[PDB]
């Protein structure tokens, strides 16, 4: 057993080893291992992506116009975000400028995704870490009504409603078929909600499972379907016709009316169900504002997103700020350049990939994706891993670094970047939110903080949805209908050789696609995805990524039941298919 120091942590693989495989209530396949000391405190944490598909290999030789459709299938949870990054990358490479309405509709597609994804994460993925569903059976329906009405104006609060929800759960359990609730962590001492808050939470779990289906109707109108809507290089294919023959065949006033109706309902659900629930989880779990800090007080990264000026990806255009903090210096938000070879690099010394020199990091334009399953000296065998060997290669996830630094990405990262750049809305949201909880600002740099920032981002995005929709309608009032530029649709118009970067802020953090086009075909296509950053394995210096760092130093009440590990991992919203692609 060895010990070394990195980023303020003492990585120590003495003591009991615990394995959580599978990690559930995530997208895709993850394994996590830890070592705990004699006080049941984590002294070593190992993040492992347990899947790979090889989209970067598959994309070679494809028509650049087709690329979005392939890379969209990196992920059905963050569905659309990879299509957006792809059309951005291809447009950047060829030099295509899209019409304003295409840009606005793309922003609507992204905002819609932020709302949907964040909502489903809060309830269906992270929720059962905080809500003791089975304890809801002990709640008083009237006291549940009282609690709900104390927290929100949301209509659905009657005693009889909560009784009906409770009764439905009771009869469900009575069947002796607990389904998705079977063999959970119910009764664990870290469940702190009173029964009434558990019943309220569970009711909201169900309401959110229902409501989330409506949000993506916006994707259906502009993009055909959800999951996996359609896009084009040059804009969007959803041609607009308001006042001419054949408007029945296009985005018309009736289609726009449907979109408006969904926007209003989406804002209302998020503002009156999710936001109060997140604050309530905060109130009953304040100690988790001091757990799972990880890299969030050290190194955070955002590329920025939502260009409000069409075809302008600069700081004055992006509504979601970009920037990097390193060394815990939040007074110096540094600019990010995705073409600079000394900035974003990926290492594979601790990953299942071949490089000519695994001691160096490769910028994505020099990226290599050559799979090499070699887990080394595991406890077990190559096909029966009892314990990964984190001293060697232990993941299908590459290790991204920014100027050699290990970074956290995602809602909390974005909140901290915007806050420290002096975004007024963000400072106000964060101050008021932490005030309501009677916690210091530093409490946001935590597992609880990740959850609170995500919730607030859903509110932010629901607001932006209306703003974008209103900008679309303003263009239509002015007779500006264009949704595609076709000037450079034909391969004959393209440079023989060119390369481009497409970047955005996906629900889980900073996303980039790096594309090289040669002779009308994809020559290279490299993706670095938010969960790649967060779930990263170690690098040649032994530096740990965001997950490993957040898990370090964490107390477990009951080693056999990994509730604390789940809480922290889930707070990052892991997307493993994304991470590996």
């Amino acid at each position: 057993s060895t010990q070394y120091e990195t980023q303020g942590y003492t990585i120590n693989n003495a003591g009991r080893r615990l394995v959580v495989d599978p990690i559930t209530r995530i997208e895709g396949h993850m394994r996590c291992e830890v070592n705990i000391n004699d006080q049941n405190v984590i002294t070593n944490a190992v993040s492992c992506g347990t899947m790979f598909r090889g989209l970067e290999i598959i994309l070679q030789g494809r028509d650049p116009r087709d690329a979005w459709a392939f890379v969209e299938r990196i992920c059905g949870v963050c569905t659309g975000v990879h299509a957006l990054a792809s059309v951005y990358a291809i447009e950047d490479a060829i030099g295509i400028k899209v019409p304003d309405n295409a840009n606005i509709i793309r922003n609507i597609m992204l905002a819609t995704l932020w709302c949907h994804d964040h909502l489903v994460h809060f309830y269906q993925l992270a929720g059962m870490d905080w809500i003791d569903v089975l304890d809801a059976l002990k709640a008083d329906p009237r006291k549940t009504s009282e609690l709900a009405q104390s927290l929100s104006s949301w209509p659905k609060s009657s005693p009889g409603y909560f009784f009906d929800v409770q009764n439905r759960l009771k009869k469900f359990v009575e069947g002796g078929q607990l389904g998705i609730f079977r063999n959970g962590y119910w009764g664990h001492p870290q469940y702190k909600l009173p029964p009434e808050a558990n019943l309220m939470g569970f009711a909201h779990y169900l309401e959110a499972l229902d409501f989330q289906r409506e949000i993506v109707k916006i994707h259906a109108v502009f993009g055909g379907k959800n999951p996996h809507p359609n896009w084009i290089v040059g804009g969007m294919p959803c041609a607009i016709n308001i006042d001419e023959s054949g408007a029945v065949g296009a985005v018309n006033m009736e289609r726009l009316n449907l979109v408006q109706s969904i926007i209003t309902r989406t804002a209302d659900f998020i503002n009156n169900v999710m936001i109060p629930d997140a604050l309530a989880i905060g109130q009953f779990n304040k100690p988790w504002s001091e757990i799972g800090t990880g890299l969030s007080d050290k190194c955070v990264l955002s590329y920025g997103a939502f260009p409000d000026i069409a075809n302008d990806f600069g700081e004055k255009s992006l509504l979601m700020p970009g920037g990097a903090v390193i060394n815990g210096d939040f007074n110096n938000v540094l600019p990010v350049d995705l073409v600079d070879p000394q900035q974003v690099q990926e290492f594979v010394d601790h990953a299942w990939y071949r490089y000519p020199n695994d001691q160096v990091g490769r910028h994505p334009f020099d990226g290599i994706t050559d799979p090499w399953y070699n887990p080394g000296d595991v406890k077990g065998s190559d096909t029966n891993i009892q314990q990964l060997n984190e001293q060697e290669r232990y993941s299908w996830i590459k290790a991204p670094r920014w100027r050699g630094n290990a970074m956290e990405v995602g809602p909390l990262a974005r909140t901290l970047i915007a806050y420290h750049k002096g975004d007024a809305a963000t400072v106000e949201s964060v101050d008021r939110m932490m005030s309501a909880l009677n916690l210091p600002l530093s409490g946001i740099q935590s597992t609880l903080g990740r959850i609170l920032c995500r919730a607030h981002e859903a509110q932010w995005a629901a607001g932006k949805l209306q703003y974008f929709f209103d900008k679309l309608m303003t263009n239509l009032k002015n007779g500006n209908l264009a949704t595609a530029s076709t000037e450079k649709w034909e391969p004959a118009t393209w440079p023989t050789e060119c390369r481009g970067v497409g970047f955005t802020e996906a629900p889980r953090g900073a996303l980039g696609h790096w594309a090289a086009i040669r002779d009308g075909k994809i020559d290279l296509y490299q993706c670095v995805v938010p969960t790649t950053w967060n779930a990263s394995p170690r690098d040649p210096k032994g530096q740990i990524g965001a997950y490993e760092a957040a898990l370090m130093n964490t107390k477990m009440a009951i080693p056999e039941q990994p509730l604390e590990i789940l809480r922290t991992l889930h707070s990052f919203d892991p997307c493993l298919a994304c991470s590996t692609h």
């Binding site: 347990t50 116009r65 949870v77 989330q212 109108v221």
Partner: protein
């Protein structure tokens, strides 16, 4: 007692789970609480790690011969199957163990049915559809990337209400939803018949909803319910929102040339 369902996940993007929870009628909520017993599902279940595998093992033992196995994604044969690792072992082993106790298997999506995107050239992981690995069990193929939400739930209700598997075409796809082509129920077919085609994006034709054949629409060779049942509670489908069908329900559609070519 509700029919036991074990839902496993191979190499995937999780689009098929996401589609399922979009169901408008019945709501996914009601499918889970009233229609089936969703007894195992990594994406949604409370239990993780050893607790989750305790459920997996007990379910497939207790309900041996009597559970439905739903499969999302597929098994890779490359690297001794360790392109997809499940509780430290190749996914394909979990698939075989789950398959052996199942009464029947649902192959959700193009992934489980055919291969989908990871099986597109050059198929780095040797991703393989379920019916090439499990050869002694009924397999209902429900293709699409993903399939339509209300088709997924409709097939479930068929199995519950009628206590039988849907009848299938020669490829194992339910006749009810896959018996006819997108192009044979497409509302733009009048334009195809008349030679009224979109020729470039956002042209006058596109703004009148003309046929997308010249923009590469693969509806003429694709079997699904998108042009009839439509998507997301009858709101739209690819063609309606102005993009040609990619052919996403068909075996090998990724490798059938550019989406924008004939």
């Amino acid at each position: 007692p509700r029919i036991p369902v074990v839902w496993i996940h191979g190499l995937e993007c999780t689009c098929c789970t996401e589609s399922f929870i979009r169901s408008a009628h019945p709501l996914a909520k009601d499918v889970i609480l009233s229609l089936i017993s969703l007894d195992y599902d990594d994406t949604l279940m409370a239990a993780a790690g050893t607790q989750a595998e305790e459920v997996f093992e007990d379910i497939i033992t207790q309900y041996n011969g009597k559970y439905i196995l739903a499969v999302e994604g597929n098994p890779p044969l490359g690297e001794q199957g360790m392109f997809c690792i499940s509780s430290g072992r190749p996914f394909i082993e979990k698939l075989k163990r789950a398959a052996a106790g199942a009464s029947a298997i649902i192959a959700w999506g193009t992934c489980a049915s055919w291969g989908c995107v990871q099986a597109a050239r050059p198929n780095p992981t040797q991703a393989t559809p379920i019916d090439k690995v499990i050869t002694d069990k009924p397999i209902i193929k429900v293709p699409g990337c993903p399939p339509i939400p209300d088709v997924m739930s409709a097939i479930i209700t068929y199995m519950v209400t009628f206590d039988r598997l849907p009848d299938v075409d020669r490829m194992g796809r339910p006749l009810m939803f896959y018996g006819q082509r997108i192009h044979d129920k497409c509302y733009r077919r009048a334009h195809f018949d008349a030679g009224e085609f979109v020729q470039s994006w956002d042209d006058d034709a596109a703004r009148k909803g003309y046929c997308l054949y010249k923009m590469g629409c693969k509806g003429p060779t694709t079997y699904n319910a998108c042009s009839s049942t439509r998507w997301n509670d009858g709101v739209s489908f690819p063609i309606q929102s102005g993009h040609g069908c990619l052919g996403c329900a068909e075996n090998g559609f990724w490798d059938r040339g550019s989406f924008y070519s004939r």
